[PDB]
Design a binder for this molecule. Structure first.
Ligand SMILES: OCc1cc(-c2ccccc2)on1
Length: 126
C-alpha cells in the first residue's frame, strides 16, 4: 500500500540521516576525501527519497486523500528547501569554503529536524 511505500521512503530518509552524520564527523576531522564520497552518496539517497515522496503524493492525490495531500504538499515544500541548501553545501565543498559548509550543515539539521513532526503526521494520514 501507500503506507508500506511511505515506510520504504522513511527508511531511505533515515539512511540519509545516518550518512549525513557520518559525513559531518568526517568534515570536522578534515577528512575531505571521505566527505567528497559521502556527499555523492547523500545526493543519491535524497534523490531516491524525493522520488518515493513524489509517487506517494501523486498516489494520495489519485486516491483523493485530502489530508494526506495537504501534509505531503507541506512536506515536499520543506524538502525542496533542503535540496537548495544541500546544493549550496556541495558547492561550498567544491569551492573550499569551510565557513559556508559549516553554516549549511547546521541549516540542513534545523531543516531536517523541523520537518519531522510533519513526517510522523503523514505516516498516520496515508
Ligand atoms: O532536509 C531534507 C533534504 C532534502 C534534500 C535533497 C538534496 C538533493 C536533492 C534533493 C533533495 O536534502 N535535505
Amino acid at each position: 500500500s501507500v503506507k508500506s511505500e511511505y515506510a520504504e521512503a522513511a527508511a531511505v530518509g533515515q539512511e540519509a540521516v545516518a550518512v549525513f552524520n557520518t559525513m559531518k564527523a568526517a568534515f570536522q576531522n578534515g577528512d575531505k576525501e571521505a566527505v567528497a564520497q559521502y556527499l555523492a552518496r547523500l545526493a543519491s539517497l535524497y534523490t531516491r527519497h524525493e522520488e518515493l515522496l513524489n509517487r506517494i503524493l501523486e498516489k494520495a492525490r489519485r486516491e483523493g486523500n485530502k489530508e494526506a495531500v495537504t501534509l505531503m504538499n507541506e512536506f515536499t515544500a520543506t524538502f525542496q528547501t533542503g535540496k537548495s541548501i544541500f546544493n549550496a553545501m556541495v558547492a561550498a565543498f567544491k569551492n573550499g569554503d569551510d565557513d559556508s559548509f559549516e553554516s549549511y550543515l547546521q541549516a540542513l539539521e534545523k531543516v531536517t529536524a523541523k520537518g519531522e513532526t510533519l513526517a510522523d503526521q503523514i505516516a498516520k494520514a496515508l
